[PDB]
Design a protein around this ligand. Sequence first.
Ligand SMILES: [Zn+2]
Length: 461
Amino acid sequence: GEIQWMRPSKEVGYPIINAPSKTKLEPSAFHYVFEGVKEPAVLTKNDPRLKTDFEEAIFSKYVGNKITEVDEYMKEAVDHYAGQLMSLDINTEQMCLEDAMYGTDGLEALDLSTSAGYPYVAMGKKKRDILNKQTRDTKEMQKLLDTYGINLPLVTYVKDELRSKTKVEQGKSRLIEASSLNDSVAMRMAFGNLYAAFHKNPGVITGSAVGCDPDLFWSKIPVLMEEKLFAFDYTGYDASLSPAWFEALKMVLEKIGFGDRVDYIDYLNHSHHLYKNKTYCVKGGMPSGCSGTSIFNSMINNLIIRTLLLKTYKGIDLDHLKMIAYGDDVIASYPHEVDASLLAQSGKDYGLTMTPADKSATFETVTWENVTFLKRFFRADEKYPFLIHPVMPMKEIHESIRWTKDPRNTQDHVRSLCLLAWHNGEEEYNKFLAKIRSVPIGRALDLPEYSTLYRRWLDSF
RNA sequence: CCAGGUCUCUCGUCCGG
RNA sequence: GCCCGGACGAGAGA
Ligand SMILES: [Zn+2]
């Protein structure tokens, strides 16, 4: 990923866009009950907590492009992945405008409570104004596609979310690219049957976890994996993606029967963003707020990992690779052990920055004991060993609970945290509820006991 | 008064067969 | 009771 320029959008005939500038996160009724280090992330340059320059820090992730050509390991990667997808028999037809807008089996409607993006955002024009779920009316959208076309620029916003201390001081505030409504509709007409096929088929054929429910899928994964696990983290994954990876994506797309709309992928490469009083242009890198990013990132991840196993371990058999990705996140296995430090090595040469799983300082054997996916651990039930708990550490549930975006939500919020927490066991769970109830508002909250959630889980199988 | 993407899963409220 | 479905809200994850 890399910027190609920046300039007053006036220069290019684009409106100025008015980001909001106050966090929406305020302290919770439980802000002092529970400990934590995170706080809302920097939204502006005029933020007191800044220990460095803002706009410089947020655009820092675009680290340049290491490659542009698809070498023969990538090519074989492509060939192997596409071959797997072909087994799913993905419907390769355009999706009708109505289904693309309103949903079909496996694809949810567009989100009516979010922005319609450029230019609708400078026209004070909203999705609710354009979309009607009840009549599923396409006429107005069709008219806006005709009028404004596609390939619009993406509006940038800083993500209002909790951030650690050094990421606040460092102004490492993650960014968001609001895809235009025109472009989401277009992307969903082209790709919707692909998204649907993926959503319906989380596992090792797609190499993707999109569409899984960790409370249930965790019990599938160890079976799906080969004998020996390996994993690692990326630094700035989406932004470190070089054009060669996108080309290789297009190659998988041609290969599974989407050849005719691979031009859409080019637009995810050469993207124009409007951020406040400016405009810029990026080359490579995948815009986060776009349609299908979640699938495309998972797919590339599958290409990346295949590529490095072929580079590093000569003669490796890809038919015994079993991997599941969620965008950059991935858990992977193989019948014999593979060294992630060696994979990280080969990574360097494709612009990929790979570090040991879970911020550990050294690369170590990844085991069913230390492995994490979607931030959860894997722990066999004591009573039923074949059923696996997704175990998210209390640490992060503690961070979440200390804040609210609207105290009106306290019941839902805290109870949702309960669903994540109880997997930590009955003794940790009951201590959680003790704490919650340690303040009056906590005693107003209807919370489920361990045994109800446990039984709920067992039943769900 | 508003304002801040793409998705998945789940919970909750409410309404339905 | 069990199942299936819808609108809205929220949490987490990527
Ligand atoms: Zn340009």
